[PDB]
Design a protein around this ligand. Structure first.
Ligand SMILES: Cc1ccccc1CN(CCN(Cc1cncn1C)c1ccc(Br)cc1)S(=O)(=O)c1cn(C)cn1
Ligand SMILES: CC(C)=CCC/C(C)=C/CC/C(C)=C/CONC(=O)CP(=O)(O)O
Ligand SMILES: O=S(=O)(O)C[C@H](O)CNC1CCCCC1
Ligand SMILES: O=S(=O)(O)C[C@H](O)CNC1CCCCC1
Ligand SMILES: O=S(=O)(O)C[C@H](O)CNC1CCCCC1
Ligand SMILES: [Zn+2]
Lengths: 315, 482
C-alpha cells in the first residue's frame, strides 16, 4: 500500500500546504491520493523555497504523474542548477522518460534548457538522439522545432562544422526518401538549403535545388509539400516561373515528367495554379483568369470562392 | 450566398491519389478518408428537405453538448491540472456559443475560482496561485473567462482585474525577451501562442506600452514560413542580424500569429508593425481545407489530417488574413474565401459525438469528444455560419464616440522612457486600440446556416474568440467607456 508522506521520517519536519482554489471550485479534478499528497508537500517545499535532494526527488515524482506540470518542471530546473547536479545524468533521465512514454511542451523544453546550460563543444550526440526519436514519430512538431533550435543555437556559437551540416542534409534526404509527403522534413530541408545564415547560394546551388524539387514533383505529382516548396523557392529567390513551365505543363492537361506514373489523375490543381501565376508573370491576365475559373468551377471546387477571388483579381 | 461554397454532398468524393508511391502519410490519409466518408454516407444531407429515411440526422445536438459540458472531472484529467483556466474557458465559451446561460451563483463560482489562480505579483497560473506560477496562456484563458462569466459589481471579478493591471503588466515585462519574443512563464518556452495570449490581454486591459511591444512585430513576422502559414517561433541570429522560422506552418501558430499581427496594426508606433505576407497567409489558410472525401474540415499543416479544432485555428484566421489582404490591396490602389458550407457539414456530420451518447464534439470520427474540441469546433462553426468583417466605418464610429478623458491609471513602465512620449500620444493609442478591438461586425445578409436555423449558434469575435456581447462591455469597463 501507499505510505503517506506525513508518515515518512524524511519528511517529518514539513507541514503540507493544501491546495487553495477556495470553496466550491469549478472544474475540480479528482486526484489520486499519491498526486494530492505529493502536491501538498510540493506546495510546502516551494513556499519555503527549499533547494534539496528531497525536493528534487519530489519534483520527479510529480512530473511522472503529470508531465505537463510546468510549475514543477520550472522548480526542477532551479533545483538542478542550485544543487549543481549533473546535467548529463538529467539528460539520461529524460531519455529514460522517453522509454516510459512521458512527453510534452515541458519535457522537450527541459531538454533545451539542459543543452543550453551544458553548452557542449559538440552537440552531435543530441542531434543523433533527436534523429532516433523522430524515426517512430516522424512529424512530431516540437521535436522538429527543437532540432531547428539546436542547430541555430549551436551554429551561432560556431559549433556546427561543415561535415555536420553535410550529414544533416544526408539525413534529411533519407527522411524524404522514406516518406516524400513528410512536410516536416521539407521544412527542415528549407532551413538546411535556404534559410539558415550559413547556407550557400550560387547559380549551381539554385540549379541543384531546382533539380531536387522537380524530381520530387515528378515522383509524386499530387504531393502538396513539393509544390509549396517549389513555389516558396521561386518566390524567395525572385526566379521567373516561365522558364520552368515545360516541366509543369504536362500536369495541367531540367527534369521532365515520366508516361506519367499510375494513379495520377489530371489536371493537378497546383499545376494549374502554377500555370495561372505564370500567365500573370507574362501580363496575360485573361488567360490567368480562365485558369482560375476552371480551378473554381471544375478542378478544385472546395476552394471555388478563393479561385473566384483570384479570377476577379485579374478581370 | 452559396454559389461558391458547394456542399460536400454535391461534389465527387475521390481519395488523395497515390501516384503509385505508397508512404506512411498516404496510409493514414486513406484510412482517415474512409472513416469520414463512411460517416457522411450514413448521414442525411443537412441541406436536403426530404430528410432521408434510415439515415442519421445531422442537426446540432445542443442539449447533448450542454450536458457534456455540465459534467467534477475524473482522474484522467490530471494531465490538464495545469490548464484549469482552459477547462473553464472551453466550457463557458461553448455555453455562450450554444446560447445557454449560467445562473448568477454558478457565474460567481467561476469568478471566485479564477481569482484564486491570480498571483499578487502578476498573472494567472493553470491553477491556484499557492500551487502554480503565472503563465501567459492561462492568463488569456482566465481573462476571457472573466469576460464571459464576470461583471462590474464587487463580486464580479472585473474590479480585481482592474486592480491587477500593473502587476499583470510587470509579469508581461518579465516575460519579454529583447528579440520581441516572450517566455510563456518563468523559465518557459518562447512562442507565438504566448505573444497572442499576452497581446489579447494587454489590449483588453489597457496596458499596452511601447517598451512592451518593441520587436514583437519582428518576432511574429519572422515566424512566417515559405508555405505562407506561421511557425511557433523565429530564431534571432546575433537587435539580430537575421531571424529564421523554426518549424512548419501550423494552424495553431498561424492563428496566433495572424491575430497577434492584427492586434499590432492598431498600435500607432512609427513603421510598425513590420509587414507579413498576407496573400501567402490567405493562400496557406484556404489550402488547408480538406477535400469532399474528408468532409471539408481543416487540417493543421500540409500532408497531415483534418481535425475539427482547426475549424477555429485555421477557419477563424480566414477573416483576419482576408482583412490584411484587403488592406494591402487598398494601399496599392464578393465570394466567401473558404467553403463555409462544407466546414459546417464537417462540424454537424463528422465532429459531433454520435447521437444519444455523451455529447461533445471531437477531432474526427474515432476520437473521444473533449472540452477543447467542443469549444474549437463550435468557435469555427460560428465563423462559418456568420460572415465576419473588420469594418473601417465601424472603427470610425468608435473613434467618434471614444472619451479620452475617461480611463484607469496609466501603467508605470519598467524603464523610465518605456511609456508613451506624452498624454496626447497615449490617448491616441488608447483610442486606436479600443476602437479597432471593437471593429468586427457580422455582415447583414452574410449568414449561412447549413441545415436550418435550429443549427445557428452565436457569433464569436475573430482574434479574441469571445462573443461580441461579452467583448464590448468588458473592454468598455477597462477603458471606462461603458
Ligand atoms: C491550449 C492547450 C491547453 C491545455 C493543454 C494543451 C493545449 C494545447 N495542446 C492541445 C493538445 N490536445 C491534443 C489535440 C488537439 N487536437 C489534436 N490533438 C492531438 C488536447 C486535446 C484535448 C484536450 Br481536453 C486538450 C488538449 S497542443 O499545444 O496542441 C499540444 C501540446 N503537445 C505536447 C501536443 N499537443
Ligand atoms: C494557446 C494557443 C492559442 C495554442 C495554439 C493552439 C494549437 C492548435 C497549437 C498547436 C500546437 C502544436 C503544433 C502541437 C503539435 O502536436 N499536435 C499535433 O501534432 C496535431 P497535428 O497532427 O494536427 O499537427
Ligand atoms: O441535443 S438534442 O439532440 O437536440 C436533445 C436530445 O436529443 C433529447 N431528446 C429528447 C428525447 C426524449 C423525448 C424528447 C426529446
Ligand atoms: O506573492 S506572489 O509571488 O504573487 C504569489 C505566491 O508567491 C505564490 N507562490 C507559489 C508558491 C508555490 C509554487 C507556485 C508559486
Ligand atoms: O427555421 S428554418 O430553418 O426554416 C427550419 C427549422 O430551423 C428546422 N429545424 C428542425 C425542426 C424539427 C426538428 C429538427 C430541427
Ligand atoms: Zn484537434
Amino acid at each position: 500500500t501507499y505510505i503517506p508522506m506525513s508518515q515518512r521520517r524524511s519528511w517529518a519536519d514539513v507541514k503540507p500546504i493544501m491546495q487553495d482554489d477556495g470553496p466550491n471550485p469549478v472544474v475540480p479534478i479528482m486526484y489520486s491520493e499519491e498526486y494530492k499528497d505529493a502536491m501538498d508537500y510540493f506546495r510546502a517545499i516551494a513556499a519555503k523555497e527549499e533547494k534539496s535532494e528531497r525536493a528534487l526527488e519530489l519534483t520527479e515524482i510529480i512530473v511522472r504523474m503529470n508531465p505537463a506540470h510546468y510549475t514543477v518542471w520550472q522548480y526542477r530546473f532551479s533545483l538542478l542548477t542550485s544543487l549543481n547536479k549533473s546535467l548529463e545524468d538529467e539528460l539520461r533521465l529524460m531519455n529514460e522518460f522517453a522509454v516510459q512514454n512521458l512527453k510534452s511542451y515541458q519535457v522537450w523544453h527541459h531538454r533545451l534548457l539542459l543543452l543550453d546550460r551544458i553548452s557542449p563543444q559538440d552537440p552531435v550526440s543530441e542531434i543523433e538522439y533527436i534523429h532516433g526519436s523522430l524515426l517512430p514519430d516522424p512529424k512530431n512538431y516540437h521535436t522538429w522545432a527543437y532540432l531547428h533550435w539546436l542547430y541555430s543555437h549551436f551554429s551561432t556559437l560556431g559549433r556546427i562544422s561543415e561535415a555536420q551540416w553535410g550529414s544533416e542534409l544526408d539525413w534529411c534526404n533519407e527522411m524524404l526518401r522514406v516518406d516524400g509527403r513528410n512536410n516536416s522534413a521539407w521544412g527542415w530541408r528549407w532551413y538546411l538549403r535556404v534559410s539558415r545564415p550559413g547556407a550557400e547560394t550560387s547559380s549551381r546551388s539554385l540549379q541543384d535545388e531546382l533539380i531536387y524539387i522537380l524530381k520530387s514533383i515528378h515522383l509524386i505529382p499530387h504531393n502538396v509539400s513539393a509544390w509549396n516548396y517549389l513555389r516558396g523557392f521561386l518566390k524567395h529567390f525572385s526566379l521567373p516561373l516561365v522558364p520552368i513551365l515545360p516541366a509543369i505543363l504536362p500536369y495541367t492537361a531540367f527534369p521532365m515528367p515520366s508516361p506519367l506514373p499510375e494513379d495520377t489523375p489530371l489536371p493537378v490543381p497546383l499545376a494549374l495554379e502554377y500555370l495561372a501565376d505564370s500567365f500573370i508573370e507574362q501580363n496575360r491576365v485573361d488567360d490567368a483568369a480562365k485558369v482560375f475559373e476552371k480551378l473554381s468551377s471544375e478542378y478544385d471546387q472546395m476552394r471555388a470562392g478563393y479561385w473566384e477571388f483570384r479570377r476577379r483579381e485579374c478581370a | 450566398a452559396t454559389e461558391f461554397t458547394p456542399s460536400v454532398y454535391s461534389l465527387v468524393s475521390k481519395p488523395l491519389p497515390s501516384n503509385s508511391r505508397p508512404s506512411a502519410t498516404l496510409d493514414e490519409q486513406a484510412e482517415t478518408e474512409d472513416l469520414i466518408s463512411q460517416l457522411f454516407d450514413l448521414t442525411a444531407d443537412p441541406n436536403a428537405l426530404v430528410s432521408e429515411h434510415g439515415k442519421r440526422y445531422s442537426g446540432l445536438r445542443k442539449q447533448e453538448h450542454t450536458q457534456f459540458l455540465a459534467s467534477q472531472l475524473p482522474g484522467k484529467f490530471v494531465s490538464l491540472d495545469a490548464s484549469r483556466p482552459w477547462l473553464v474557458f472551453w466550457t463557458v465559451h461553448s455555453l455562450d456559443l450554444l446560447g445557454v446561460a449560467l445562473d448568477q451563483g454558478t457565474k460567481d463560482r467561476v469568478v471566485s475560482t479564477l481569482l484564486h489562480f491570480l498571483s499578487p505579483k502578476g498573472g494567472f497560473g493553470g491553477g491556484p496561485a499557492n500551487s502554480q506560477i503565472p503563465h501567459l496562456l492561462p492568463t488569456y484563458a482566465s481573462v476571457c473567462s472573466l469576460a464571459i462569466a464576470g461583471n462590474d459589481s464587487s463580486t464580479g471579478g472585473w474590479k480585481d482585474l482592474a486592480a491587477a493591471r500593473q502587476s499583470i503588466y510587470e509579469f508581461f515585462m518579465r516575460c519579454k525577451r529583447p528579440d520581441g519574443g516572450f517566455v510563456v512563464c518563468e523559465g518557459g518556452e518562447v512562442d507565438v501562442r504566448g505573444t497572442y495570449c499576452l497581446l489579447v490581454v494587454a489590449t483588453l486591459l489597457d496596458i499596452i506600452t511601447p517598451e512592451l511591444l518593441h520587436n514583437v512585430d519582428k518576432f511574429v513576422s519572422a515566424c512566417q514560413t515559405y508555405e505562407g502559414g506561421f511557425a511557433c517561433a523565429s530564431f534571432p541570429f546575433p537587435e539580430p542580424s537575421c531571424r529564421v522560422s523554426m518549424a512548419e506552418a501550423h494552424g495553431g501558430y498561424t492563428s496566433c500569429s495572424l491575430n497577434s499581427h492584427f492586434l499590432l496594426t492598431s498600435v500607432p508606433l512609427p513603421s510598425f508593425p513590420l509587414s507579413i505576407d498576407a496573400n501567402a497567409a490567405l493562400r496557406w489558410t484556404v489550402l488547408q481545407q480538406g477535400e469532399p472525401i474528408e468532409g471539408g474540415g481543416f487540417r493543421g499543416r500540409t500532408n497531415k489530417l483534418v481535425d475539427g479544432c482547426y475549424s477555429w485555428w485555421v477557419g477563424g484566421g480566414a477573416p483576419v488574413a482576408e482583412e490584411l489582404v484587403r488592406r494591402e490591396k487598398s494601399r496599392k490602389v464578393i465570394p466567401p474565401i473558404f467553403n463555409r458550407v462544407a466546414l459546417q457539414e464537417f462540424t454537424l456530420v463528422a465532429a459531433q459525438q454520435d447521437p444519444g451518447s455523451t455529447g461533445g464534439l471531437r477531432d474526427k470520427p474515432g476520437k473521444r469528444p473533449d472540452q477543447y474540441h467542443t469549444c474549437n469546433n463550435l468557435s469555427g462553426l460560428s465563423i462559418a455560419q456568420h460572415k465576419m468583417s473588420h469594418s473601417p466605418s465601424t472603427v470610425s464610429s468608435n473613434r467618434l464616440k471614444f472619451d479620452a478623458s475617461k480611463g484607469l491609471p496609466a501603467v508605470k513602465p519598467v524603464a523610465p522612457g518605456g511609456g508613451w512620449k506624452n498624454e496626447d500620444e497615449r490617448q491616441n493609442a488608447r483610442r486606436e486600440i479600443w476602437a479597432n478591438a471593437l471593429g468586427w461586425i457580422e455582415e447583414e445578409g452574410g449568414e449561412i446556416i447549413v441545415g436550418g436555423k435550429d443549427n445557428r449558434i452565436n457569433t464569436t469575435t475573430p482574434v479574441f474568440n469571445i462573443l461580441g456581447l461579452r467583448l464590448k462591455p468588458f473592454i468598455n469597463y477597462f477603458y471606462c467607456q461603458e
